[PDB]
Design an enzyme around this catalytic site. Structure first.
Site, PDB file in Angstrom:
ATOM      1  CG  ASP A  10      -1.898   1.178   1.204  1.00 31.79           C
ATOM      2  OD1 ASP A  10      -2.039   1.835   0.150  1.00 31.79           O
ATOM      3  OD2 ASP A  10      -2.504   1.456   2.260  1.00 31.79           O
ATOM      4  CD  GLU A 460      -5.465   0.297  -3.055  1.00 30.92           C
ATOM      5  OE1 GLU A 460      -5.081   1.272  -2.376  1.00 30.92           O
ATOM      6  OE2 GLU A 460      -6.310   0.390  -3.964  1.00 30.92           O
ATOM      7  CD  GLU A 464      -2.296  11.583  -0.090  1.00 33.05           C
ATOM      8  OE1 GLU A 464      -2.632  12.786  -0.062  1.00 33.05           O
ATOM      9  OE2 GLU A 464      -2.021  10.927   0.937  1.00 33.05           O
ATOM     10  CG  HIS A 544     -24.198  -3.670  -8.753  1.00 31.72           C
ATOM     11  ND1 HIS A 544     -24.158  -4.587  -7.725  1.00 31.72           N
ATOM     12  CD2 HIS A 544     -23.304  -2.704  -8.432  1.00 31.72           C
ATOM     13  CE1 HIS A 544     -23.284  -4.189  -6.818  1.00 31.72           C
ATOM     14  NE2 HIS A 544     -22.751  -3.050  -7.223  1.00 31.72           N
ATOM     15  CG  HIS A 679      -0.628   3.716   5.841  1.00 30.95           C
ATOM     16  ND1 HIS A 679       0.017   4.261   6.931  1.00 30.95           N
ATOM     17  CD2 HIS A 679      -1.181   4.755   5.173  1.00 30.95           C
ATOM     18  CE1 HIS A 679      -0.144   5.572   6.925  1.00 30.95           C
ATOM     19  NE2 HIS A 679      -0.867   5.898   5.868  1.00 30.95           N
TER      20      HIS A 679
END
Lengths: 1000, 88
Positions: A10, A460, A464, A544, A679
């Site tokens: 991550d 992942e 940002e 969906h 994280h």
RNA sequence: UCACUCUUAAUCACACGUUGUAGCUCCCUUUACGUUGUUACAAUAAGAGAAAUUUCUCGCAAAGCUCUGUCCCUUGAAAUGUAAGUUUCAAGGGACAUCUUU
């Protein structure tokens, strides 16, 4: 033996979470092996967001400019001394040079005055640099210079000195530029004309020291500016016929045209037209190559910027710099028709040799004298190629037929993976992304060293990462927009359902939003839906529209609120397929009118009314991160590291939306605290996204749509296992106690997660604070600076050095700030007339810790410590600070921070004291006292109190002041020891240094 | 060795610059600084002639100093490196 | 419903700002220091390396582990010795720098 594991990562602008999850011989995870988090300081300015090297670049520019000024002043002084103008280097030359320069006109000046004005002209020479191109700063400077040049062309101002003594110092009261002004800046040409005029006038007026050679040397000084597989044969010059032809051949054979995947090389018939454009046109652009060839709009060149003409019209392929430079110099002053074998010699002559004589002797035979004049006057060649001369004359005729570099080289001359190599910094402009990927590389290497080669790496990437400063700041803005919007939506939901039982679930807010947007009617059937019945189970569901099994789309554009009456009949088709839209039935047309009349955005409307499945492309777009960093990382990890995974997708960079979906349906959505551990969470889930897991999810969605009771999880009790392993202080005890039915979770690798922070041990930094104070008050410890009135607030007013000398000044300035409500500019924006004009008056400030600068006549505040030496004296801890100015001077301080007393007399770390160890910023320390024990990263020293700040490893809100223990005193503590941590958070152990190291 | 305008481009080469790595940090930094500075000054010795703000006679004066200055620096660079025993 | 806070500027240069010593000038404290405005000159990171009061280059960043150093770890070999445990060398893996690059 080595495990079979997938490594999940991550990545974010300031952190790298990592998980190691064991998998079986299928693509099925079994149990969590390891987990950790590594933080680092965001590789950019903490506040401004500029590059961390920009300040260093500006400092270098300033240092160089001052150095050049000093050097040319030295040369001018020496030249005047040799020509007998200056008796010796240091004479107290007059100070009225401006009035002397005008007096130098229409009068003769003595030797001292003439030397003074000459050195003043050399010192203040002016600007050189059409106009109006880029900047407002330039704009202002150029406007001032142009206005001054316009003013100078009048009889009243014969020269800039006369303009200064006539126009400047009668309407402003000063000659020099004041504050941020450019109205008094002069052109270099104007001041050169002034110097020539002074020489001409003083010559005729009887001055002996006005030689022609002196004038020429002074013009040289005042105008000078620094310009911006082979045998023994040497390499060829860049600015030659053969080398430029070589580079053009490489670029022409490296051309690929991309047309919606039809990426192809040029037709050999098309290449002949492009063969020689640069000889006809000085700089052929991509516009030229597209226009000359047979191309079209849906076709663009590799390395695209992106049709938009400026991207292609203003992009040069090959610039015949030498060819057209020689063309212009020969045409302005033989003809351009030249034979290659002579162009190469000309280029080598101007690249190897720079004097007239050497290049004339090297090219005396094969060049006529007028060509010598034309080339000598206006040519300059700089650089060289990395290929020998003899190689080019053979390699060129082969690659002109459509060859490549290595292939032709082989025709002429026929004859590291286990870890991740360093990041290819040329492919990554962003320093922040560069540091993020560097720390990711370090984490990957540590994990490989601890467990071996991973089967797969799943990634992942934070939203940002890979963005500019302003983009992330606007993302923050709209994040807060969404925050206020969601809390207001909760308030509105509470308004519409007053009798609710507290905080809504996430489904209910979206149910209300869809109720509003479809106008209280279901889309498929058209039946009216009642708001009061909305919240009972089974009445409605969020469906969906395009099935998730076929699209994997969890976006808002795919959700519609639907009564459970009709979904029992549909299955997992699309509205076009469900409502028989191919035949344009009444059902489909009514549904289409209903959706088009809704408040939906256009993209949502078209996604509902798709008519097209495009399953492969849509699913691949929805499942994988398509951004630049994700693709680059996939390619780099796959090509440069060893992965024991079968297939071609050994590296998986998942779309953040699917990661959020998995984190939500796996139960750990809002399992993130305010500490840095969270994280790791994402890493774990992205490590569990193996293709078998996604197939299981697809089958479960097929179940719930049309055909396991609950959503698939990697194993039983996955949520709590992950939560304990990441956030528990002693995960072994919690795993054994609160989760008895899963003995597999507690194994030999289960350890408390320690967050590893990036070390900061550099000894180089800013020497002192930029603000420079005067040093003659340090004997009492006060700071005298000039204090501008427009900046002086009430507090600075009383700290003046003149309330003891001018009570009228103090009282009048006091009431001025009162009438403006403590506003300095408003009060003294009008010229303050003392009982003379006052613009800035000296002040007093706190100064008892400073660096001696400006040849010992100035002082400055300390900027930042680079080391702290922990000593033991008298059975107690003492801390000696070490700043950058001490390091540069090479001094080793022996004074430890003691309270209520200043460095004039601190506790001396003498022979009686014993050196314990040394600490750099962000180093790990363990402190045990009579009350508690803290293991945290050292986070600075207070020079006044003598206390320290240490950072909690994860920054819990529950510990310290928002995660840091501020103001901890260690003088009377029990044990204060330095420790060490690996990049993975492992191996926390004592380190005992032997000797105190020097600062240099 | 002796350096003039004739041999400066021949001696200021990447092979000689690369073989300065074996030097210790004490002497390596000033020698490389002098040698790289000499190359940059000499490579742009004729750059003055390409500016409209410099007269041809002035550009001639600048070019002579640029070559003279740059030749002097490399002579210092070789002399100090040869003092350390360089296989130049 | 075991789901969610995922609708580029570089490199050359200019001009300030500040500190100090001089020339002017405004105020002004005691039994000579301050000190307004203005001009000149020196300095404008603290400094370091090398070679001759003088010359070059580096001097607030990033990354790197080839050299050097610090620290952490694994492995082996010697001298030991009130038989416990020390002291020393050899080499393998990492993290960082006062080391190396750009």
């Amino acid at each position: 033996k080595n495990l079979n594991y997938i490594l999940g990562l991550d990545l974010g602008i300031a952190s790298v979470g990592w998980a190691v999850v064991e998998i079986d011989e299928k693509e099925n995870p079994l149990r969590l092996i390891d987990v950790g988090v590594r933080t680092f300081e965001r590789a950019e300015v903490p506040k401004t967001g500029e590059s961390l090297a920009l300040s260093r670049r500006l400092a270098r520019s300033a240092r160089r400019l001052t150095q050049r000024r000093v050097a040319r002043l030295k040369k001018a002084k020496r030249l005047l001394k040799s020509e007998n103008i200056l008796l010796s280097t240091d004479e107290r030359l007059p100070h009225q040079v401006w009035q002397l320069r005008v007096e130098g006109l229409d009068h003769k000046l003595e030797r001292q005055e003439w030397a003074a004005v000459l050195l003043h002209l050399i010192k203040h020479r002016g600007y050189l640099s059409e106009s109006k191109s880029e900047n407002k700063e330039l704009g202002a400077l150029l406007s001032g210079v142009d206005n001054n040049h316009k003013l100078l062309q009048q009889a009243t101002y014969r020269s800039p000195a006369e303009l200064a003594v006539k126009k400047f110092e009668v309407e402003e009261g000063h000659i020099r530029n004041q504050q941020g002004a450019y109205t008094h800046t002069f052109s270099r040409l104007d001041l050169l004309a002034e110097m020539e005029l002074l020489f001409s006038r003083q010559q005729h007026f009887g001055n002996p020291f006005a030689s022609e050679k002196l004038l020429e040397n002074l013009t040289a000084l005042l105008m000078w500016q620094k310009p911006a597989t082979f045998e023994d044969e040497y390499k060829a010059a860049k600015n030659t016929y053969s080398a430029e032809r070589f580079v053009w051949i490489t670029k022409l054979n490296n051309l690929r045209i991309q047309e919606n995947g039809l990426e192809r090389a040029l037709n050999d018939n098309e290449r002949l037209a492009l063969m020689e454009q640069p000889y006809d046109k000085n700089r052929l652009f991509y516009s030229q190559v597209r226009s000359i060839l047979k191309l079209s709009d849906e076709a663009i060149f590799k390395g695209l910027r992106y049709d938009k003409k400026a991207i292609e019209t203003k992009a040069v392929l090959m610039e015949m710099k030498a060819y057209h430079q020689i063309r212009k110099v020969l045409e302005g002053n033989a003809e351009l028709k030249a034979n290659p074998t002579l162009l190469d010699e000309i280029g080598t002559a101007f690249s190897l040799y720079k004097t007239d004589e050497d290049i004339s002797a090297y090219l005396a035979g094969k060049l006529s004298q007028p060509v010598l004049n034309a080339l000598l006057e206006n040519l300059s060649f700089d650089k060289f190629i990395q290929l020998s001369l003899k190689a080019l004359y053979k390699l060129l005729p082969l690659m002109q037929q459509g060859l490549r570099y290595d292939e032709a080289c082989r025709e002429i001359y026929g004859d590291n993976h286990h870890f991740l190599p360093q990041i290819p910094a040329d492919e990554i402009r962003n320093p922040v992304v560069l540091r993020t990927l560097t720390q990711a590389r370090k984490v990957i290497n540590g994990v490989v060293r601890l467990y071996g080669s991973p089967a797969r790496i799943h990634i992942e990437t934070g939203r940002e990462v890979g963005k500019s400063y302003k983009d992330r700041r606007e993302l923050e803005k709209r994040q807060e927009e969404n925050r206020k919007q969601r809390e207001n939506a909760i308030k509105e939901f509470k308004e519409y359902f007053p009798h609710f039982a507290g905080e809504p679930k996430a489904k209910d807010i979206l149910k209300m939003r869809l109720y509003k947007q479809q106008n209280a009617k279901c889309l498929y059937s058209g039946k009216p839906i009642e708001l009061h019945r909305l919240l009972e189970k089974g009445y409605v569901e969020v469906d969906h529209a395009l099935p998730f099994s076929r699209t994997w789309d969890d976006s808002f554009n795919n959700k519609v609120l639907v009564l459970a009456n009709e979904n029992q009949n549909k299955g997992n088709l699309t509205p076009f397929e469900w409502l028989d839209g191919k035949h344009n039935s009444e059902r489909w047309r009514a549904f289409k009118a209903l959706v088009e009349t809704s408040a939906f955005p256009y993209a949502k409307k078209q996604r509902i009314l798709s008519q097209k499945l495009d399953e492969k492309g849509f699913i691949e777009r929805n499942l994988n991160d398509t951004r630049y960093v994700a693709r680059f990382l996939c390619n780099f990890i796959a090509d440069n590291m060893h992965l024991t995974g079968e297939g071609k997708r050994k590296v998986f960079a998942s779309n953040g939306q699917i990661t959020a979906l998995l984190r939500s349906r796996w139960g750990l959505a809002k399992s993130r605290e305010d500490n840095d551990r969270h994280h790791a969470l994402d890493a774990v889930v992205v490590a569990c996204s193996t293709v078998a897991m996604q197939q299981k999810i697809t089958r479960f969605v097929r179940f719930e749509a049309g055909d396991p009771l609950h959503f698939p999880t990697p194993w039983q009790f996955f949520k709590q296992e992950v939560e304990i392993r990441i956030f528990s202080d002693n995960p072994k005890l919690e795993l054994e106690n609160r989760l008895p039915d899963r003995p597999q979770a507690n194994h030999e690798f289960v350890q408390p997660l320690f967050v590893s922070r990036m070390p900061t041990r550099k000894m180089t930094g800013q020497g002192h604070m930029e603000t420079v104070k005067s040093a003659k008050r340090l004997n009492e410890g006060i700071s005298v600076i000039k204090m501008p009135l427009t900046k002086l607030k009430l507090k600075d007013l009383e700290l003046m050095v003149n309330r003891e000398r001018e009570k009228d000044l103090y009282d009048t300035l006091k009431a001025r700030l009162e009438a403006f409500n403590d506003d300095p500019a408003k009060a003294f924006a009008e010229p303050f007339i003392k009982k003379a004009i006052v613009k800035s008056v000296r002040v007093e400030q706190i100064q008892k810790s400073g660096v001696l600068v400006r040849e010992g006549n100035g002082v400055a505040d300390n900027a930042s410590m680079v080391r702290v030496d922990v000593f033991t004296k008298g059975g107690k801890y003492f801390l000696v600070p070490i700043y950058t100015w001490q390091v540069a001077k090479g001094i080793l301080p022996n004074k430890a921070a003691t309270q209520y007393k200043d460095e004039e007399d601190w506790e001396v770390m003498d022979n009686s004291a014993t050196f314990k160890f040394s600490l750099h910023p962000n180093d790990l320390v363990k402190l045990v006292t009579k009350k508690k024990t803290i293991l945290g990263y050292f986070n600075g020293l207070n020079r006044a109190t003598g206390n320290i700040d240490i950072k909690e490893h994860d920054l819990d809100k529950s510990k310290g002041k928002q995660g840091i223990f501020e103001g901890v005193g260690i003088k009377l503590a029990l044990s204060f020891e330095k420790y060490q941590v690996d990049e993975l958070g492992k191996n926390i152990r004592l380190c005992k240094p032997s000797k105190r190291q020097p600062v240099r | 060795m002796k350096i003039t305008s004739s041999n400066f481009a021949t001696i200021a080469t990447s092979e000689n610059f690369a073989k300065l790595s074996v030097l210790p940090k004490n002497h390596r930094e000033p020698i490389k600084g002098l040698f790289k500075s000499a190359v940059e000054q000499f490579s742009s010795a004729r750059d003055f002639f390409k500016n409209e703000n410099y007269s041809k006679e002035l550009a001639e004066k600048f070019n002579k100093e640029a070559v003279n200055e740059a030749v002097e620096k490399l002579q210092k660079a070789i002399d100090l490196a040869e003092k350390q025993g360089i296989q130049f």
